[model samples]
Target: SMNPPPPETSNPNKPKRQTNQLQYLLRVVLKTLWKHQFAWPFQQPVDAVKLNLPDYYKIIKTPMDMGTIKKRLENNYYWNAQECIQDFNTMFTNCYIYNKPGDDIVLMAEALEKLFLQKINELPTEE
Candidate 1:
């Protein structure tokens, strides 16, 4: 199948919502990915011209990137840590499907994914 769908979210209220420290720590993890050198390709959405993959759009309908997740986090787009976690998975999953085995981009995604899983494990379980 080409193009799995991106996560769906909905909300309307604001201002009254209290800030949670979980989000803070999530941002901390995000910063680490941004600093990683291998994260270069994942720092932003993939462009058709940049990678020269004409069928990229067809293959990957729900493109994601570090910056997009950062924006989602900042906007309180996630109601639970699980939602954000899936986006992280989605980002890497897309890379895995689009790139070939042992490709540099795929390798980078694997490395970041390993680190991400451990970081997620360290995240406190919220009530």
Candidate 2:
């Protein structure tokens, strides 16, 4: 039999590595946090200020992510918690909404965005 031709080279202009989409990454991070319960690999910082209390308690709770994660893991699903955390950090760095010295402030900024999205989606839109 004749030997096959050598494989063609890829376009030199293409990116050497791929990047995850915001929503795709958000889902990954959400799932990881949901599963890890804010434990090692993805610890949720404590808020003595109680900024997210009451209405935002759901997100503030340390074990908030536990319930969802348990079910998913139970089904043998696997997600990278480390990657999730990294993605979060990168997103916060790029947000540029508020310049802070720590992840605490970054998380708070992200929370505000989440809150806004949630609240807006709950309302009806006018034609």
- Mind giving the per-residue lDDT tens digits that candidate 1 earns over 1-127? 2333443333456322323534754567788877887888887777776567778888887788887787777766766666677778889999988889999888899989887777766765453
Show model 2 residue runs off by greater than 4 Å: 1-102
Cα lDDT tens digits, model 2, 25-92, are 33543443434322332233322244333333233222222233333333323344333334344433
Tell me the lDDT of model 1 at 118: 70
- Candidate 1 yields a Cα-based lDDT of 0.72
Badly placed stretches (over 4 Å) of model 1 are 1-22, 125-127
State in Å the error of residue 123, model 2: 2.4
Which candidate number has the best lDDT?
A: 1
What would the TM-scores of all predictions be?
0.80, 0.21
- Listed per candidate, the RMSD to the true structure in angstroms reads 4.3, 19.8
Pairs that collide, model 2: 34-65, 35-69
Evaluated at residue 66, the lDDT of candidate 1 is 81
Residue 32 displacement (Å), model 2: 26
